[PDB]
Design a protein around this ligand. Structure first.
Ligand SMILES: O=C1Cc2cc(Nc3nc(Cl)ncc3Br)ccc2N1
Ligand SMILES: O=C1Cc2cc(Nc3nc(Cl)ncc3Br)ccc2N1
Ligand SMILES: [Cl-]
Ligand SMILES: [Cl-]
Lengths: 4, 124, 124, 4
């Protein structure tokens, strides 16, 4: 999971 | 927004759609290319091809279970492109590049047409 | 094999599937969550959820146009997860994390359950 | 396009  | 994103989600979805294709699950159309038949999901074809997008948004053609391609279309070129749609992988070879590019132009698959033109320009 | 791969293909396919969802094109099922209704593509739901995969591979349920979820399921949690399925983006907030995790467990969306458990463990 |  990432900060888009 | 403040959303988080799962990097592999789109790839995992496509992998699962290809698994459904391989097991012939919920396929809703047959694409006829001369003597060959290819089962697929209308939504995946529309998501990958400007031609299928136009076909299945047509109020009459959206309901067809069989679509016949132009007789000039090569079944192997179509097969390679159908595999690309469901996997992101393109089996581009010296022996098939002309058929693949001609099929991608007909299907309106701009990125495929672009890499074919570049690979051809490199070999001249 | 000797294939080449188009990096953005899976993301572009999903973006187009979401565009079809937004315009209600070729949606083939309604998911009922209490008083709310959500139109979707069976194939996308199966590709994202272990529960929908099991439902639409069932020889009888594969043909249903309406699926009613358990009454304990929160419509907002479902909406957030449906958006995630079509976009890879999860709108996870302090106010919705419990409903989202409960909905992801029911839907069998393992990666969503995993990030919810981690975000909850961080706030304790 | 890349070599996967
Ligand atoms: O080279 C390509 C690939 C492609 C795909 C689609 N498909 C869709 N396009 C839009 Cl804007 N909305 C929903 C869908 Br499905 C249209 C055109 C093209 N040209
Ligand atoms: O957390 C998750 C997400 C998910 C998706 C599917 N979907 C499919 N799985 C397989 Cl193996 N083939 C085709 C399809 Br469609 C099954 C289980 C799960 N569990
Ligand atoms: Cl393309
Ligand atoms: Cl997930």
């Amino acid at each position: 999971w990432v900060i888009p | 927004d403040s959303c988080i994103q799962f990097t592999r989600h789109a790839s995992d979805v496509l992998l699962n759609l290809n698994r459904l294709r391989s097991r012939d699950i919920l396929t809703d159309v047959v694409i006829v290319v001369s003597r060959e038949q290819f089962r697929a999901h209308k939504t995946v074809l529309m998501a990958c091809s400007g031609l299928f997008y136009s076909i299945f948004t047509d109020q009459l053609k959206c309901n067809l279970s069989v679509i016949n391609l132009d007789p000039e279309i090569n079944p192997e070129g179509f097969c390679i492109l159908l595999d690309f749609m469901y996997t992101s992988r393109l089996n581009l070879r010296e022996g098939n590049i002309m058929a693949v590019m001609a099929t991608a132009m007909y299907l309106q698959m701009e990125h495929v047409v672009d890499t074919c033109r570049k690979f051809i320009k490199a070999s001249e």
